[PDB]
C-alpha cells in the first residue's frame, strides 16, 4: 500500500466487511 | 492461701500405656482401620485439652513436657560445647581472630565429601559455622578446651536433672490444679527470682572473670599466659593490676560511696575500638542495674504476707465510659485456659525476638562480631524467622482460644464482648488501609519500572527525579547524635554508631559500623514492610475474631476449630475455619520476613560492610549501588537475585557445595509443596483406588486400607514444604555468598 | 518385659532400626569398595 | 394445626452490634423469632457478642433463616426451650415456617405428605445420554 | 457523656452503632447542610454546586505532578486532563443513571427521620432526578476546572 | 432370605463392598420390607461404617 | 433451587432431617424399612448445599442426594 | 419498650434517613435561574451520552493530530543514528 | 509509512474511545432486566 488512495479502497473495504460480520452476529443471536 | 500442693503418686510409671500406641485418646485406642489412623496419631498427639477435660491434668501434663523440653534444651547445649571443645580450630583462632575463620564441625571420609573439610585456617580443616559461639567464648572469657569439655559435661547433668523432674513431678508428686492457678507468686518469683538474680549472678561472673580476662586479650597478651579466672578471684591485688578500684574492697558498695567504681562500672557509647563490640565493662553495669531493677519490681504482687497487690482489683479499676465494664473477667480468663496464655506469651516472645535481631547488629555485644559478616547475618536472619513463626503461633491459639474456651454466660464483661461486637467494622478498615498501603507502596516500584522502561528516568521516584525523603527518621538520627551533648550529659558517646553522629571504626580492615544513610529507597521499603505486615494482621485478625460465627455459618464453634469446609453450598465454604487463616498468614508472614532479609542483606553490603585502606579511602561490597537500584523490581531481579546469586551456583568442586546442592534441594522442595496446594483429596482418593485393584490382583492388598490424606493435611503438607522450600532457597544463597565474600 | 518387646516390635522403632543397619552396611561397603561404578565380575 | 400468630412482645437487652440487619430486610424478606423462658439467663447470640433474655415472652428478629434455626437449636438443646420463628415480607405479610405442624421435623408424625421421595436405590437412575434433547435430568423420574 | 456509645435509634437489632463519629450535634449538622444530602432542593442545583467544588479541586494533582509538569505549557495540560476527567466522569454517571433508574418508580430514597416522622424521599433517586445531577454536575465541573486555571495560570497571588 | 451367618457375596453395583464377602447378621421377616438382609463386612467403607442391609435378589454367591 | 431426592433405602435414622440446618428435611409416614419412617424435603427451597444431610445417612453409598442447580438469594446464604 | 410492628414496618426495619436537610431553598433566585437556564439542556441523558461520545472522540483526535513537535517524544521522531544488528544485520 | 498521520488518529480512537463506547454500551446490555 506505498499509494495514498489505496489506504481508503483497504478502509471502506473493511468497512464493508464489518457490516456484514455485524448482520451475521445479529442473525447469530 | 498459698501454699504447696501435692498429689502423691498420681499414675504408676509402666509400659502398658506404652505398648497400645493410641492410647490417650478413646476415638483411635481402638485400633487403625484405615490408614488415616497413623496421621490423626500424631496429629494430635500432644491436644492434651483435647483428650481429658479437666484443667489438673492438662496442667501436670503442660509441666512434664515443659522440663522435657528444657532436658532437650541442655543436651542440645552441652553437644555444641563438647564440639567447640573436640572439634574446634578454638585455641587457634584465639591467637588470631581477624584471619581465622572459626569452625566446630568436621566429616568423616567416607564418599568424596572429605572436601566439605575446607581450609579454615590454623591447620585445621572443617565446615565454617555461622553461629557466633566463638564470639561469645570470647565475651565469656572462655579461653582454653578443658574449660569448654567440663560445661559440656555439666550440661549433659542437668540434662539428666531434667528429665528427672520431668518424671518426679508427673508421677511421684504431682501438684494439682490449685497450685498452678497460684499467678502472683509465680510472678513474684519469675521476676526477682529468675530474671533478678539471674542478671545479678551473671554481673557477678563479668565483674569477676569477664572484664579482667577480656582487658588482658585487648592488650595482645599471648591467651595461654592469661591467668586462670580463678586467679582473680583469690587475689585482689592481681585483679586490681587493672581496675584499681578494687583496691578499695567491698567497702564503696555498703557507704554508698560507689561513684568511685567508675573503673569497672562504666557509661560510655560506642564500641570497642580494636574489637568492634561493647565494652564489657558497660555491660556489666547495665546487668547490675537491670538485676536490681527486676528484683525491686519482683515485689508487687501479693501473697499470703499481707502487703502486695492483686491482679483482680488492679483490672477492674480500669472501667472507664468508652469500653463498657472495663477489663472485668480477664483474671478468670488467664487462669483457667492455658491458651489465652500462651497466645499473649507468644505474640510478645516473637516480638522481642524481633527486638533482639534488630538490636543485635546495631550494638555488637560481642567482640569481633561486627567484622565476621557472616555470623552478623545469620544472626539476624534466623531470630527474624524465629519471631514471624511466633507471632503467628500466637494468632492461631488465640483463636484456639475462642474456639472452644470462650463462653458468654461469664464473658457479659464487655471488653471483649465489645471488641468481638464491632469485627465487622474492624476488619473493614483494616481492609480498606491495607489496600491502601498496598497501592501507594507497590504502585510506586511499578511507577519507576515503567519510566525506566519508557527511557525517561526524570518521571521516576529516584533520589536525583521526585523525592520521597523520610524525615521523621533522618530527625531521629540527628536527636540521638547529639543525645550525649544535651539529653545525655554522662554517656561519654551515642548509644550507636548507625545513628548520624560519630565516625566510622576498623577491626584491622574491614569496616564494623558507620552512620547509616537514610532516603527514597529506604522510604518505600518501610512502606512495603508496613503494607505486608499490615496484610498478615489482617488475615489473622480476621480469623480470629470469626473463629466463633459470621454471616455465612452462624454456628462455626459448633463445628470446631480444625475443619476443612462447611460444603460446596453457599457457592462455596472451603477454608472458612480458624486453622485454614493460619494456613493462610503463613504465606504472608513468610513474604515479609524474606523482604525485610533482603532489604538488610542488601542494605548492609551496599551502605555498611567494606574494606578500608590506608588514608580512610572505603570501598563497600557492592558499592553503594542500593540508593539507586532498589527503586525498581528489575534492580531487585538482577542487582540483587542475578548478581549475589553468581557465588552459589558456581560452588561446586569447593568448600561450599553443600550450600550449592542445597539450594536445588530447597528449590525441589518449594516446587514439591505446589503439588498439594493445588490439588484436592478426591483425585488422589480416586486414583490409588486403580493401584488397590493391582494389589488385589495380586494379592498384596494391605489391611489397613490406603485412604488419600485429609483435606486438612493436604494443605498443612503444603504449606509445611513451601516454606522448608523458602527459608531453605534463602538460606543456602545467603551463606554462600557472604561466607565467600565477607 | 513383655510389653518393652512389644513396644520395640512397632513400626517406627523397627523401621529407624533397620535403616540404620542398612545404611550401616551401605557405608562400610563404600568405606572398603570405594568409587565403584562398573562391576568387575 | 392453626399457626401461632405474631404479637409485640418485648426484646433481648443487647447493647447493639454491627451483625444485625441491612437492607435486604427492608427491599426483600426477614426472619423473626420468639420463644419463652423461664427466668433471666445469659445467652450467645448467632451475630457476635452475649444478651440477657428476659422472663415470659422474648422477640427477636435477624437477617437470614439459618441464623433463627442455629439460635434455635442451641435454645432446645442448652436451655430446653421451645420456639418458633417466621418470615417478613417488606408489605408485612408474615409468614410462618418452623413448627409447620407444631412437631419438630425429628419426630414422625400423621398428615404429612412425602415430597422427592423416588421408589428406587439411588444406583438404577439412566444415563444421562438418553435423556438428550429432553429437559428430564435423571432423577426427576 | 456517660456511656457515648449507643445503637442506632435505639435499637440493638440493625447494623452499627451511634458512635461520636456518625452520630454527634455538630457531625449531623455538617452532614446535614451538605448539598447531596440537601432533601428539598432541585437536584440541578446540588449537581451544579458538587462539579463545581469537585472540577476546582481537582487541577492540583494533574497540574504539579503530570508529563508536562516542567514546559511552558504547564496549567493547561492539567487543566485539560481534568476537565477530560469530569466528562468522563459524567459518561460513568450517565451509564449509571440509565442502568440503575427506570421513569416509572415513585422513589428508592428513604421517607423517614431519624424519629420516623413521615416525611417525603428524595427526588435524587429518580430517573430525571438523576439526569438533572448529571447534567448540573457537567456543567460545574467544567465551570470549576475553568475557574480554577483561570485563577491560577492567568492572575497573580501565587501559593 | 438366606440363612443366618451365611457368607454372601454382594452384587450391588454402587456399593463400596461390591464382589466382597459378609456374613449375614439377622434378615427381618416383615411382610412389606424392600432390604431386609442385614450383613456386617470386616473392612469400613469411604464412610466408617460396615453394616448394611441388601435385598435376598441383590446378594448370593454362597 | 437445589434439588435434594430421598431414594428408598432410607432406614429411618431422622439423622438427616436433624443436621439440616435450614428446616428443609422433615420426616414422614412411609412403611417398608423398620418403623414406617422416611426422610422428605417438601422446603428445597430453603436448601444451601450444605450438604450435612449426605454426611450423615449411614447407607450403602446414600439415600439422600442433593442436586446443585439454579442460584438464589435464599441458597447463596447472602445475609446483605 | 418494643421493636416490632407490622404496621410501622419501616420503624422496624431501618430505613430511617440519617441526615435529612428538608430546606426547599438555599440559594440565591438569580443565582438559580441562571444556573437552571444554562445547565438545564445538558439533563437529557439520552442526548447526551451520544454528545459526551463524539466530544470526547472529536477531542483526542484534534489533539492527536494537530500536536506539537516539542510536546510529544513518539511525534518528534528520531534525531539520531541508528544502532547496529548484533550479527552485522541493520 | 506513507500517510504517518493515521497512527495519530487511530490509536487514539481505537484504545480509548472504542474500549470507553463498548463497555457503556455492554453494561447496559448487562445490567438491564427487560
Ligand atoms: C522412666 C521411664 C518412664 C516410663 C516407663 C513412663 C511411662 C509412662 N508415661 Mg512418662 N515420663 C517420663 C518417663 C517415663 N514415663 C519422663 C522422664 C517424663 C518427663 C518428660 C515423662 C512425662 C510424661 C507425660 C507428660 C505423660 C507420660 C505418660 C506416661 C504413660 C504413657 C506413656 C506412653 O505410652 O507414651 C510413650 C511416649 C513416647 C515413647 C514418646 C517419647 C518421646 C520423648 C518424650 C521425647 C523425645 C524427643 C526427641 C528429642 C526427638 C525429637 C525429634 C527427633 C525426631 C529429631 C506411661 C505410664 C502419659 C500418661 O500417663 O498420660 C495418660 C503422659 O501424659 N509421661
Ligand atoms: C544437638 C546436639 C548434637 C548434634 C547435632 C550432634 C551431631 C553430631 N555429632 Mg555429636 N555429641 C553431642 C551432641 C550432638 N551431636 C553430645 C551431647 C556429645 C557428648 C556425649 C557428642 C559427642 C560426639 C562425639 C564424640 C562425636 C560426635 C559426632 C557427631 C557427628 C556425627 C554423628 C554420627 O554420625 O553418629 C554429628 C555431626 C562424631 C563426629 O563428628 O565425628 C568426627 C564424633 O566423633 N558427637
Ligand atoms: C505504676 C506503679 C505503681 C502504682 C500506681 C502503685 C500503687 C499502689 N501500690 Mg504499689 N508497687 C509497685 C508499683 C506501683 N504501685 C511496685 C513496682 C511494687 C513492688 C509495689 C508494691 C506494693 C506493695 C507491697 C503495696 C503497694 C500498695 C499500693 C497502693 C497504696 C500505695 C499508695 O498510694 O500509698 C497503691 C494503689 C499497697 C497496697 O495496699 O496496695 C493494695 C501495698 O501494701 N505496692
Ligand atoms: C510455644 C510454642 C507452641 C506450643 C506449646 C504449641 C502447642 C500446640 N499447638 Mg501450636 N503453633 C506454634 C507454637 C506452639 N504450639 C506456632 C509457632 C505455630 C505457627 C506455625 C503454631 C500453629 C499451630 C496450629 C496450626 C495448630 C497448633 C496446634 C497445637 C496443639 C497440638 C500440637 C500438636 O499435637 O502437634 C504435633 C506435632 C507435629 C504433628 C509435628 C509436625 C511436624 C512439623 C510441622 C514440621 C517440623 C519441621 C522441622 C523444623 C524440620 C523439617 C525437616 C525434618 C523433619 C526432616 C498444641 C497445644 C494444633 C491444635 O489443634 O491445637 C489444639 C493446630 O491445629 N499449633
Ligand atoms: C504476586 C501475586 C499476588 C498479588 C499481586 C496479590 C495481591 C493482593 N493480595 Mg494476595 N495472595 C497471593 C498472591 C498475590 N496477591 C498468594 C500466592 C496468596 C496465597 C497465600 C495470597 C493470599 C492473600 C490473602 C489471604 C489476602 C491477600 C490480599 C491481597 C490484596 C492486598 C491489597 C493490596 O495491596 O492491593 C494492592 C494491589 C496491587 C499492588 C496489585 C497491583 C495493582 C497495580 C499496581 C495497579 C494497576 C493499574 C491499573 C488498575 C491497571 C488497569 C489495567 C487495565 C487498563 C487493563 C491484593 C489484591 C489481602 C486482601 O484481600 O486485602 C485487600 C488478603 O487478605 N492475598
Ligand atoms: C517439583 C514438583 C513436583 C514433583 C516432584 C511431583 C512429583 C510427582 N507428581 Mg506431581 N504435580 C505438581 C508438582 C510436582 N509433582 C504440581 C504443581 C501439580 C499440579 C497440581 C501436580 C499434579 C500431579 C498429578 C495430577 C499427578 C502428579 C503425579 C506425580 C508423581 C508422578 C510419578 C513420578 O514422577 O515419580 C510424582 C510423585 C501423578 C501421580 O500420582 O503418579 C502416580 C499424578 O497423577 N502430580
Ligand atoms: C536410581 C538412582 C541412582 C543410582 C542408579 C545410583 C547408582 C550409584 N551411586 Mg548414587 N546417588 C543417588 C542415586 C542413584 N545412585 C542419589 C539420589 C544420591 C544423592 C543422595 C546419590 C549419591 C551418591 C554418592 C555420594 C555416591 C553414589 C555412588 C553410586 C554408585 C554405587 C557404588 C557402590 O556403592 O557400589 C552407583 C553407580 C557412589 C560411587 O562410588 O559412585 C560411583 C558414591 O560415592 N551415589
Ligand atoms: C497532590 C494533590 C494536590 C495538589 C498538588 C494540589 C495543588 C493545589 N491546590 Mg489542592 N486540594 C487537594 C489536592 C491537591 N492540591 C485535595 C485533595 C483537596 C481537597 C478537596 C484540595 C483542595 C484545594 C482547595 C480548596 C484549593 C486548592 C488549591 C491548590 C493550588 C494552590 C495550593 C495548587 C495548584 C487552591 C487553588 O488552586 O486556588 C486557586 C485552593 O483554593 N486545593
Ligand atoms: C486482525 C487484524 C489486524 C490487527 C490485529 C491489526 C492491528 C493494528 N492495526 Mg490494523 N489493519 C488491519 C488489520 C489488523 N490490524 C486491516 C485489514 C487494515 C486495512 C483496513 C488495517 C489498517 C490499519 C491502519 C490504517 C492503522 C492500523 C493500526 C493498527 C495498530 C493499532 C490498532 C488500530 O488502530 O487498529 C485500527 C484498525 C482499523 C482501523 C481497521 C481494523 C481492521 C479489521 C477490520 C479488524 C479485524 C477484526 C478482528 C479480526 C476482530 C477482533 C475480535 C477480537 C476483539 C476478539 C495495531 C498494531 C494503526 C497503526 O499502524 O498504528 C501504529 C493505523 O493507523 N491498522
Ligand atoms: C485511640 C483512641 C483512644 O484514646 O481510646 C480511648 C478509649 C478508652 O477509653 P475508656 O476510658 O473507655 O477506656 C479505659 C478503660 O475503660 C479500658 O480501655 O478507647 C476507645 O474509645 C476505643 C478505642 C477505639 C479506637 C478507634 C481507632
Not at chain 2, 519482683?298 to 497487690?309: E, K
Amino acid at each position: 500500500s506505498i499509494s495514498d488512495s489505496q489506504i481508503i479502497v483497504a478502509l471502506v473495504s473493511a468497512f464493508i466487511t464489518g457490516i456484514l460480520a455485524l448482520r451475521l452476529g445479529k442473525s447469530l443471536y | 492461701e498459698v501454699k504447696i500442693m501435692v498429689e502423691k503418686d498420681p499414675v504408676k510409671t509402666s509400659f502398658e500405656k506404652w505398648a497400645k500406641p493410641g492410647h490417650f485418646s478413646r476415638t483411635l485406642a481402638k485400633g487403625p482401620n484405615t490408614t488415616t489412623w497413623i496421621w490423626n496419631l500424631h496429629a494430635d498427639a500432644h491436644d492434651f485439652d483435647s483428650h481429658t477435660n479437666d484443667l489438673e491434668e492438662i496442667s501436670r501434663k503442660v509441666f512434664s513436657a515443659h522440663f522435657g523440653q528444657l532436658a532437650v534444651i541442655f543436651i542440645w547445649l552441652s553437644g555444641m560445647y563438647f564440639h567447640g571443645a573436640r572439634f574446634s580450630n578454638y585455641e587457634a583462632w584465639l591467637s588470631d581472630p581477624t584471619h581465622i575463620k572459626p569452625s566446630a564441625q568436621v566429616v568423616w571420609p567416607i564418599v568424596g565429601q572429605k572436601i566439605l573439610n575446607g581450609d579454615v585456617g590454623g591447620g585445621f580443616q572443617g565446615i565454617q559455622i555461622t553461629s557466633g559461639f566463638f564470639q561469645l567464648w570470647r565475651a565469656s572469657g572462655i579461653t582454653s578446651e578443658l574449660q569448654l569439655y567440663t560445661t559440656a559435661i555439666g550440661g549433659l547433668i542437668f540434662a539428666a536433672l531434667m528429665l528427672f523432674a520431668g518424671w518426679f513431678h508427673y508421677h511421684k508428686a504431682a501438684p494439682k490444679l490449685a497450685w498452678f492457678q497460684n499467678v502472683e507468686s509465680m510472678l513474684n518469683h519469675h521476676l526477682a527470682g529468675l530474671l533478678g538474680l539471674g542478671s545479678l549472678a551473671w554481673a557477678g561472673h563479668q565483674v569477676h572473670v569477664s572484664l579482667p580476662i577480656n582487658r588482658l586479650l585487648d592488650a595482645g597478651v599471648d591467651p595461654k599466659e592469661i591467668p586462670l579466672p580463678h586467679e582473680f578471684i583469690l587475689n585482689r591485688d592481681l585483679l586490681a593490676q587493672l581496675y584499681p578500684s578494687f583496691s578499695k574492697g567491698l567497702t564503696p558498695f555498703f557507704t554508698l560511696n560507689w561513684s568511685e567504681y567508675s573503673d569497672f562500672l562504666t557509661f560510655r557509647g560506642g564500641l570497642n575500638p580494636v574489637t568492634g563490640g561493647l565494652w564489657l565493662t558497660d555491660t556489666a553495669h547495665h546487668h547490675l542495674a537491670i538485676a536490681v531493677l527486676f528484683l525491686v519490681a519482683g515485689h508487687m504482687y501479693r501473697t499470703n504476707f499481707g502487703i502486695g497487690h492483686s491482679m483482680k482489683e488492679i483490672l477492674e479499676a480500669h472501667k472507664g465510659p468508652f469500653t463498657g465494664e472495663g477489663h472485668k473477667g480477664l483474671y478468670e480468663i488467664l487462669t483457667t485456659s492455658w491458651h489465652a496464655q500462651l497466645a499473649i506469651n507468644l505474640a510478645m516472645l516473637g516480638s522481642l525476638t524481633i527486638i533482639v535481631a534488630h538490636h543485635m547488629y546495631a550494638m555488637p555485644p560481642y567482640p569481633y562480631l561486627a567484622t565476621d559478616y557472616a555470623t552478623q547475618l545469620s544472626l539476624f536472619t534466623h531470630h527474624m524467622w524465629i519471631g514471624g513463626f511466633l507471632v503467628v503461633g500466637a494468632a492461631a491459639h488465640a483463636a484456639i482460644f475462642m474456639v472452644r474456651d470462650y463462653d458468654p454466660t461469664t464473658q457479659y464483661n464487655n471488653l471483649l464482648d465489645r471488641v468481638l461486637r464491632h469485627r465487622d467494622a474492624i476488619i473493614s478498615h483494616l481492609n480498606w488501609v491495607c489496600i491502601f498501603l498496598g497501592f501507594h507502596s507497590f504502585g510506586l516500584y511499578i511507577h519507576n519500572d515503567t519510566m525506566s522502561a519508557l527511557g525517561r528516568p526524570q518521571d521516576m521516584f529516584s533520589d536525583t527525579a521526585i523525592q520521597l525523603q523520610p524525615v521523621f527518621a533522618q530527625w531521629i538520627q540527628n536527636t540521638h547524635a547529639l543525645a550525649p551533648s544535651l539529653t545525655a550529659p554522662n554517656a561519654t558517646a551515642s548509644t550507636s554508631l548507625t545513628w548520624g553522629g560519630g565516625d566510622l571504626v576498623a577491626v584491622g580492615g574491614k569496616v564494623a559500623l558507620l552512620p547509616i544513610p537514610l532516603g527514597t529507597a529506604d522510604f518505600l521499603v518501610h512502606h512495603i514492610h508496613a503494607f505486608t505486615i499490615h496484610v498478615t494482621v489482617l488475615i489473622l485478625l480476621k480469623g480470629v475474631l470469626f473463629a466463633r460465627s459470621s454471616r455465612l455459618i452462624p454456628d462455626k464453634a459448633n463445628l470446631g476449630f480444625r475443619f476443612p469446609c462447611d460444603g460446596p453450598g453457599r457457592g462455596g465454604t472451603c477454608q472458612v475455619s480458624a486453622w485454614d487463616h493460619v494456613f493462610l498468614g503463613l504465606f504472608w508472614m513468610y513474604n515479609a520476613i524474606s523482604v525485610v532479609i533482603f532489604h538488610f542483606s542488601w542494605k548492609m553490603q551496599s551502605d555498611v560492610w567494606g574494606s578500608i585502606s590506608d588514608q580512610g579511602v572505603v570501598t563497600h561490597i557492592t558499592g553503594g549501588n542500593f540508593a539507586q537500584s532498589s527503586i525498581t523490581i528489575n534492580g531487585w531481579l538482577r542487582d540483587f537475585l542475578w548478581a549475589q546469586a553468581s557465588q552459589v551456583i558456581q560452588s561446586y568442586g569447593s568448600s561450599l557445595s553443600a550450600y550449592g546442592l542445597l539450594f536445588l534441594g530447597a528449590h525441589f522442595v518449594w516446587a514439591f509443596s505446589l503439588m498439594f496446594l493445588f490439588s484436592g483429596r478426591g483425585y488422589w482418593q480416586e486414583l490409588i483406588e486403580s493401584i488397590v485393584w493391582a494389589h488385589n490382583k495380586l494379592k498384596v492388598a494391605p489391611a489397613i486400607q490406603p485412604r488419600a490424606l485429609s483435606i486438612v493435611q493436604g494443605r498443612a503438607v503444603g504449606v509445611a514444604h513451601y516454606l522448608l522450600g523458602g527459608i531453605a532457597t534463602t538460606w543456602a544463597f545467603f551463606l554462600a555468598r557472604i561466607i565467600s565474600v565477607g | 518385659m513383655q510389653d518393652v518387646k512389644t513396644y520395640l516390635s512397632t513400626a517406627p522403632v523397627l523401621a529407624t532400626l533397620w535403616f540404620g543397619f542398612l545404611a550401616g552396611l551401605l557405608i562400610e561397603i563404600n568405606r572398603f569398595f570405594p568409587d565403584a561404578l562398573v562391576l568387575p565380575l | 394445626t392453626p399457626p401461632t400468630l405474631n404479637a409485640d412482645t418485648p426484646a433481648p437487652i443487647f447493647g447493639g452490634s454491627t451483625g444485625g440487619l441491612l437492607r435486604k430486610a427492608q427491599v426483600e424478606e426477614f426472619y423473626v423469632i420468639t420463644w419463652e423462658s423461664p427466668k433471666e439467663q445469659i445467652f450467645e447470640m448467632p451475630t457476635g457478642g452475649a444478651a440477657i433474655m428476659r422472663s415470659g415472652p422474648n422477640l427477636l428478629k435477624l437477617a437470614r433463616k439459618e441464623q433463627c434455626l442455629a439460635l434455635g437449636a442451641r435454645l432446645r438443646t442448652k436451655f430446653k426451650i421451645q420456639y418458633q420463628f417466621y418470615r417478613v415480607f417488606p408489605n408485612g405479610e408474615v409468614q410462618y415456617l418452623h413448627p409447620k405442624d407444631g412437631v419438630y421435623p425429628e419426630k414422625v408424625n400423621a398428615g404429612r405428605s412425602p415430597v422427592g421421595v423416588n421408589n428406587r436405590s439411588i444406583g438404577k437412575n439412566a444415563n444421562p445420554a438418553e435423556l438428550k434433547f429432553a429437559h428430564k435430568q435423571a432423577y426427576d423420574l | 457523656k456517660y456511656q457515648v456509645i449507643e445503637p442506632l435509634n435505639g435499637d440493638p437489632f440493625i447494623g452499627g452503632f451511634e458512635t461520636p463519629v456518625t452520630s454527634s450535634p455538630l457531625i449531623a449538622w455538617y452532614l446535614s447542610n451538605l448539598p447531596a444530602y440537601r432533601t428539598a432542593v432541585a437536584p440541578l442545583l446540588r449537581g451544579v454546586e458538587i462539579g463545581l467544588a469537585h472540577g476546582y479541586l481537582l487541577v492540583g494533582p494533574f497540574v504539579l505532578t503530570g508529563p508536562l509538569r516542567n514546559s511552558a505549557v504547564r496549567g493547561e495540560a492539567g487543566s485539560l486532563a481534568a476537565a477530560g476527567l469530569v466528562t468522563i466522569l459524567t459518561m460513568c454517571l450517565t451509564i449509571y443513571g440509565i442502568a440503575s433508574f427506570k421513569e416509572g418508580e415513585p422513589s428508592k430514597a428513604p421517607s423517614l427521620t431519624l424519629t420516623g416522622r413521615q416525611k417525603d424521599a428524595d427526588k435524587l433517586q429518580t430517573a430525571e432526578g438523576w439526569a438533572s445531577f448529571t447534567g448540573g454536575w457537567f456543567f460545574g465541573g467544567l465551570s470549576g476546572v475553568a475557574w480554577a486555571y483561570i485563577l491560577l495560570y492567568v492572575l497573580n497571588l501565587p501559593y | 432370605g438366606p440363612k443366618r451367618g451365611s457368607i454372601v457375596k454382594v452384587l450391588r453395583r454402587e456399593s463400596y463392598w461390591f464382589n466382597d464377602t459378609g456374613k449375614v447378621v439377622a434378615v427381618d421377616q416383615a411382610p412389606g420390607v424392600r432390604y431386609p438382609v442385614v450383613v456386617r463386612f470386616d473392612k469400613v467403607n469411604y464412610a466408617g461404617v460396615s453394616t448394611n442391609n441388601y435385598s435376598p435378589d441383590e446378594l448370593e454367591a454362597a | 433451587a437445589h434439588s435434594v431426592k430421598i431414594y428408598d433405602t432410607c432406614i429411618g435414622c431422622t439423622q438427616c432431617v436433624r443436621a439440616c440446618p435450614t428446616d428443609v428435611l422433615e420426616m414422614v409416614p412411609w412403611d417398608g424399612c423398620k418403623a414406617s419412617q422416611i426422610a422428605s424435603a417438601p422446603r428445597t427451597e430453603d436448601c444451601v448445599g450444605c450438604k450435612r444431610c449426605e454426611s450423615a445417612c449411614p447407607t450403602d453409598f446414600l439415600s439422600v442426594r442433593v442436586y446443585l442447580g439454579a442460584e438464589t438469594t435464599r441458597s447463596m446464604g447472602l445475609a446483605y | 419498650s418494643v421493636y416490632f410492628d407490622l404496621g410501622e414496618i419501616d420503624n422496624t426495619t431501618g430505613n430511617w434517613d440519617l441526615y435529612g436537610n428538608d430546606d426547599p431553598n438555599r440559594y440565591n433566585g438569580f443565582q438559580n435561574k441562571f444556573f437552571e437556564t444554562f445547565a438545564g439542556a445538558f439533563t437529557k441523558r439520552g442526548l447526551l451520552l451520544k454528545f459526551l461520545v463524539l466530544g470526547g472522540a472529536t477531542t483526542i483526535g484534534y489533539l492527536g493530530s494537530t500536536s506539537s513537535p516539542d510536546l510529544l517524544a513518539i511525534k518528534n521522531g528520531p534525531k539520531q543514528v541508528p544502532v547496529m544488528g548484533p550479527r552485522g544485520r541493520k | 509509512m506513507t500517510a504517518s498521520y493515521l497512527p495519530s488518529i487511530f490509536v487514539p480512537l481505537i484504545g480509548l474511545v472504542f474500549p470507553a463506547i463498548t463497555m457503556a454500551s455492554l453494561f447496559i446490555y448487562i445490567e438491564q432486566d427487560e
